[PDB]
Ligand binder design. Structure first.
Ligand SMILES: NC(=O)c1ccc[n+]([C@@H]2O[C@H](COP(=O)([O-])OP(=O)(O)OC[C@H]3O[C@@H](n4cnc5c(N)ncnc54)[C@H](O)[C@@H]3O)[C@@H](O)[C@H]2O)c1
Ligand SMILES: NC(=O)c1ccc[n+]([C@@H]2O[C@H](COP(=O)([O-])OP(=O)(O)OC[C@H]3O[C@@H](n4cnc5c(N)ncnc54)[C@H](O)[C@@H]3O)[C@@H](O)[C@H]2O)c1
Lengths: 291, 293
């Protein structure tokens, strides 16, 4: 079996940085790749700060160990601005760059030529057909989806997306890697939305349409789902938390792919908020105003 | 204002008994109504067993206290087989009987003649237009929906449904009553599913379709929604928990009113289980099998 040990994470953003951190924390050798030295420096800095925040807690009764732990985990993460030079002998490449199909495909088409034979390619894409990226290579049997959830270092779920061409060997390798990260992997075919978003987003859009219809206030709907369905956050609180722009992008995609399905119909309210740059918590305002 | 003190609860089933229990526990005088003295005896007995179970846990440091609590609550719950015999002096009627329009309308059409003038009529129905029931009476301004959730004694939410004719006075009165019960009322128009079921049920159906479509197993979908979305129960565990027959019933209704809507298309797997009398935890088998206690 191909036991993933050396991992190459391309993209030091919210997800990429978290992926790199959990891999390193769990004993894997990591090379985090991004476009500039500045982006990388900031990315690794946030990883350190996150690790320290946790250490200061579990190592109160021994500050020494705490710092050794952080230094150790942080020392097993390398950085680079040239992915091509790092994939020569990497066991796994996990991509988490800008959500743009053209950019992603060029990336892998290029990497496919440098990566070792056994190297597995995986995308953390939320709204893109894994197959639409696996065909940019001649490594389809070792290409798959590995979808994580933010905050990566906390969220225990990982969706292992297998395409019709993905081998069983590649699948089990990713399932074992997921468990090695201390995650609980589930399986799903290469369908839009996979499992979570496919069943969550459309529900959130329905929550918005109920409001636009004037049937109930945003506040009551949120209260209804929390007390009534036991959800951690009401649909609008969650919409703001995950980003209104992010949500809109996913739904618009499914809409352009099947403009007939009533579940993907655009929301006037959602568009207006995205228009006037109100993306939710990350912008200080979405359906609700924050801090 | 007219504060609800006397409540007539019609239906001693799962929902009704719970409603009576919470109302009586919070200081309201209650009359539980059902078809036979036996059914009523069984319901009130179930209310006692529930109160004593809550007592042993709350008054563990003083069983005597817990016995007084139970006895006091149980004492303010009278039982009658004909509601018309007590509504002339009740403040609110909360109906929770079989889910059938004709039966409900016949019930309220007749109670309308006994209930005092100030009496408010409320239906706990899940799949019927409140308005449809209200027009069986000439008291539409004092008619509304008061939708609870099982187990009533635990679930804090209560949906107060206002029809175009419900008066502001009736609405406020029901909201206050909701708070007096220790619940949290939310407002919604008389639309199919109200809030919770309108957003919950269609989602449960998509879960089933995702599975029947063979994109993922039931087990992984449940795991995915529990860990990825933070839900207490995965879609298939919740389906089995609320009732596959209860669910199929609600969806068929919506499907019937708007047959072209894809969101209400029937589930082959759901129908098959329902047809085989596999209703979920109620029968020991739904999408999953359970220990027939
Ligand atoms: N945004 C979310 O809420 C979310 C949640 C789950 C999964 N995702 C998935 O994660 C990936 C990135 O999302 P994010 O939130 O981490 O993004 P982000 O914008 O925070 O970070 C992406 C990083 O990629 C870098 N980047 C862009 N193009 C690159 C290229 N050609 N090569 C190398 N680095 C490049 C950027 O400079 C940036 O630092 C996407 O594939 C997306 O579908 C996003
Ligand atoms: N099942 C749920 O989870 C749920 C949740 C919310 C609301 N509801 C609603 O609650 C109501 C009852 O549901 P339930 O689960 O409590 O039912 P149930 O089957 O447990 O009990 C219904 C009770 O109504 C009585 N009944 C029938 N016809 C009657 C009549 N003409 N007069 C007086 N009593 C009569 C029966 O004898 C029975 O004891 C329905 O309107 C339903 O849509 C159900």
């Amino acid at each position: 079996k191909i036991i993933v040990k050396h991992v190459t994470v391309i993209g030091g953003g919210l997800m990429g940085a978290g992926i790199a951190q959990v891999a390193a924390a769990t004993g894997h050798t990591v090379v985090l790749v991004d476009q500039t030295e500045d982006i990388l420096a900031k990315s690794k800095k946030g990883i350190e700060e996150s690790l320290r925040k946790v250490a200061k807690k579990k190592f109160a009764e021994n500050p020494k160990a705490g710092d050794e732990f952080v230094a150790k985990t942080l020392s097993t993460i390398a950085t680079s601005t040239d992915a091509a030079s790092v994939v020569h002998s990497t066991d796994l490449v996990v991509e988490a760059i800008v959500e743009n199909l053209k950019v992603k495909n060029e990336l892998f088409k290029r990497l496919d030529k440098r990566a070792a034979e056994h190297t597995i390619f995986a995308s953390n894409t939320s709204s893109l057909q894994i197959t639409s990226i696996a065909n940019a290579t001649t490594r389809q049997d070792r290409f798959a989806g590995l979808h994580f959830f933010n905050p990566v270092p906390v969220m225990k779920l990982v969706e292992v997306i297998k395409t019709p061409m993905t081998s069983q060997k590649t699948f089990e390798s990713l399932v074992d890697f997921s468990k090695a990260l201390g995650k609980h992997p589930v399986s799903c075919k290469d369908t839009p939305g996979f499992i979570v978003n496919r069943l969550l987003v459309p529900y959130l859009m329905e929550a918005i349409r109920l409001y636009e219809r004037g049937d109930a206030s945003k506040e009551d709907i949120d209260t209804a789902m929390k007390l009534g369905a036991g959800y951690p956050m009401g649909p609008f609180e969650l919409l703001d938390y995950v980003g209104l722009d992010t949500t809109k992008f996913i739904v618009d995609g499914w809409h352009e792919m099947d403009a007939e399905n009533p579940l993907h119909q655009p929301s006037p309210s959602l568009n207006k908020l995205v228009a006037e740059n109100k993306f939710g918590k990350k912008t200080g305002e979405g359906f609700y105003k924050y801090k």
